[PDB]
Amino acid sequence: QYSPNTQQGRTSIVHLFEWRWVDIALECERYLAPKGFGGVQVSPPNENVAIYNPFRPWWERYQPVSYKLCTRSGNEDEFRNMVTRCNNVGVRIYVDAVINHMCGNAVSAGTSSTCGSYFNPGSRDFPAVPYSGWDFNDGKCKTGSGDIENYNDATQVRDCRLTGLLDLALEKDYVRSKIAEYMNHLIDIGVAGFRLDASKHMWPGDIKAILDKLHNLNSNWFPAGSKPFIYQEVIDLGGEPIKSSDYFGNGRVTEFKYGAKLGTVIRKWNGEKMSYLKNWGEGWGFMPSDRALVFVDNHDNQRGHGAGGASILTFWDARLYKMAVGFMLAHPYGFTRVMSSYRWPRQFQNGNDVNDWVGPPNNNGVIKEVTINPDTTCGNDWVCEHRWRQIRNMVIFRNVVDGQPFTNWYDNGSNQVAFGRGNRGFIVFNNDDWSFSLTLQTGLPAGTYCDVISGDKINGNCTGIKIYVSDDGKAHFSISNSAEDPFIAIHAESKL
């Protein structure tokens, strides 16, 4: 469960949040494969409640109605077409598996669902699965409300309703089997793995019992005996009885400490400085690198959901965001996930975004196509961070340097830092309020290298900055604190 099953030489996943299957299929072929992306995390592909108040929020996709592959991203034929086309160009698909719960217990009964299936939350009736009242934890939960009330009580966190979401009885073989049926359907289509939603809200052994029922990956694309990559969403910032390590038997685990701390460092909040990143990783109290799924922001915390956190960096803070993503992609710790977002009309009243619920760009609830502009950015209010040059080129940096040791660290005692990855790449950051002008040991072979932050290598030349590495491996770097992108990155495949 720990191997990502990406092609060799591809080292990151991109979350194409709320994208349609037909758009992802095209993206695989026209962009993700030639740019060396390892795979795509997709939004939940199973039927969910169509919530009309507020109007079609993103979070309706976390309220299942059935396991039919029928959503605003598309139908089963489109989903299958996408997985096939992506695998055929070497780009994997990872499914957001929403298996802890069905929908909210206060949702009205009817057919307000993305495939029109009938469901009745009050009576616990989900006949398109089917599930009945026997399949929920209503009798097992011990709180007075039936909901989770106290995170200091690990039992209620698992057995009670998260914010009223009907909690599936994952200790029952019937329920485990219906979930496995769904996940095996997806495996056989060709999915390479799963993001397991709300993993803290499930017992590790119930997750295990489900995974035990799963097939090996599709043997047309994956070697015999390949297992789905599993990465579990567990928010563990410390101080709770449930720990991310409790889930290591099932797969990797999201390291939410990563983006929380990195955001505070890059914002220069709380006395933090980039020079302290010299021991980034386990030295900062993070889980083992071979289990961490790392990221700057995710779909919840870029809008204050989940654990939130004011320090989280997002596309709204583009300059600092690019720096944080760049540091993450250059540093060997963890398996990296890049976010790809849509814009929404963020509006703060008191201190909260009252539009944090807004769903993807849409016309009367129909998700808009991802249109591609001539400069390779996206239209229709899709942000497409994964197409920003500075991020796309850092995805390739990570591939080029894969396996190479962290080395040649420099810092000025403040926020001017640099480091290399063996003899294959070097990166330099200036987050201080003055210019960084210095000759540094890069560890690289002598030559002229294109800076992949400011430009690209093409036709034996560079479209941005050029760095000149001498025979002794030293090169001069000058980065103004006024730079739009105050970091420079060079690697073996950007050498002229």
Ligand X SMILES: OC[C@H]1O[C@@H](O)[C@H](O)[C@@H](O)[C@@H]1O
Ligand Y SMILES: OC[C@H]1O[C@H](O[C@H]2[C@H](O)[C@@H](O)[C@@H](O)O[C@@H]2CO)[C@H](O)[C@@H](O)[C@@H]1O
**Does residue 493 interact with ligand X by CB under 6 A?**
no
Helix (H) or strand (E) holding 194: strand 193-196
What residue type is 92 in one-letter code?
R
- If we measure between CA atoms, which residue out of 323, 293, 297, 291 comes closest to residue 310? 297
Residues 217-256 that bind Cl ion (CB under 5 A): 233, 254
Reference 449, options 397, 373, 405; nearest CA is 397
Which of 27, 159, 233, 255 is the catalytic position?
Answer: 233
Decide: 307 and 256 in contact? Cβ < 8 Å: yes
**Pick the catalytic residue: 18, 159, 197, 297?**
197
Q: How far is the CB of 495 from ligand Y (least distance, A)?
A: 34
Q: Which of 177, 279, 461, 470 binds ligand Y (CB under 6 A)?
A: 279
Task: For the chain, state the CA radius of gyration.
Answer: 23
| Degrees to nearest 5, angle at CA 264 with 263 and 267 | 85
CB of 174 to ligand X, least distance (A): 13
Among 9, 34, 54, 241, binds ligand Y (CB under 6 A): 54
Tell whether omega for the bond before 130 is within 30 degrees of 0, i.e. cis.
yes
Active-site residue, 197 included: yes
Q: Which of 99, 141, 235, 475 binds ligand Y (CB under 6 A)?
A: 235
The DSSP H or E segment spanning 441 is strand 436-441
**154 touches ligand X by CB under 6 A:** no
Beta strand pairing status for 252-254 and 292-294? parallel
| Cα(405)–Cα(422) distance, integer angstroms | 5
Among 203, 276, 344, 357, binds ligand X (CB under 6 A): 203
Query: How crowded is residue 339: how many other Cβ atoms within 10 Å of its Cβ?
Result: 25
Beta carbon of residue 233, minimum distance to Ca ion (angstroms, whole number): 13
Closest CB 202 distance from Ca ion, rounded Å:
5
Report, in Å, the least distance between residue 266 CB and ligand Y.
Answer: 13
Nearer to Cl ion, 221 or 315 (CB): 315
Judge contact between 215 and 182, C-beta under 8 A: no
# of chain residues touching Ca ion (CB under 5 A): 4
Interface residue with ligand Y, options 39, 44, 45, 104 (CB under 6 A): 104
Encoded tokens for 418 = 């640099």
Of 126-134, 201-209, 263-271, 331-339, which part binds ligand X (CB under 6 A)?
201-209
Subset of 268-307 contacting Cl ion (CB under 5 A): 298
Question: Is-contact 229 216, C-beta < 8 A?
Answer: no
By CB under 6 A, residue 241 contacts ligand Y: no
Between strands 487-491 and 461-462, the pairing is unpaired
Residue 5 touches which of Cl ion, ligand X, Ca ion, none (CB < 5 to 8 A by kind)? Answer: none
- What binding mask, one character per residue, do residues 83-102 give for ligand Y by CB under 6 A, x or -? --------------------
**End-to-end distance of the chain based on CA atoms, in angstroms?**
39
| Smallest distance, Cl ion to C-beta of residue 15, A | 8
| Residue 374: cis peptide before it, omega within 30 degrees of 0 | no
What is the C-alpha separation between 372 and 299, in angstroms, rounded? Answer: 22
The 3-state secondary structure of 359-387 reads: CCCEECCEECCCCECCCCCECCCECCHHH
Give the contacts of 215 (CB within 8 A, at least 6 positions apart).
184, 187, 188
The site that binds ligand Y (CB under 6 A) totals a number of residues, namely 25
The interface with Ca ion within residues 158-197 (CB under 5 A) comprises 158, 167
Q: Is 130 in the site for ligand Y (CB under 6 A)?
A: no
Contact track, ligand X, 160-179, x by CB under 6 A: -----------x--------
Any catalytic annotation for residue 233? yes
CB 134 → Ca ion: shortest distance, Å?
Answer: 16
If DSSP codes are grouped into helix, strand and coil, which group holds residue 468?
Answer: strand
Q: Answer yes or no: are the C-beta atoms of 252 and 289 closer than 8 Å.
A: no
Single out the residue of 17, 21, 31, 59 in contact with ligand Y (rule: CB under 6 A).
59
Residue 2: count other Cβ atoms within 10 Å of its Cβ. Answer: 14
Residue 54 binding partner per list Cl ion, ligand X, ligand Y, none, with a CB distance cut-off of 5 to 8 Å that depends on partner kind: ligand Y
Residue ranges binding Cl ion (CB under 5 A):
233, 254, 298
Residue ranges binding ligand X (CB under 6 A):
171, 203, 205-206
Residue ranges binding ligand Y (CB under 6 A):
53-54, 59, 62-63, 104, 106-107, 151, 163-165, 198, 200, 233, 235, 272, 276, 279, 283-284, 300, 305-307
Catalytic center residues: 197, 233
Residue ranges binding Ca ion (CB under 5 A):
100, 158, 167, 201
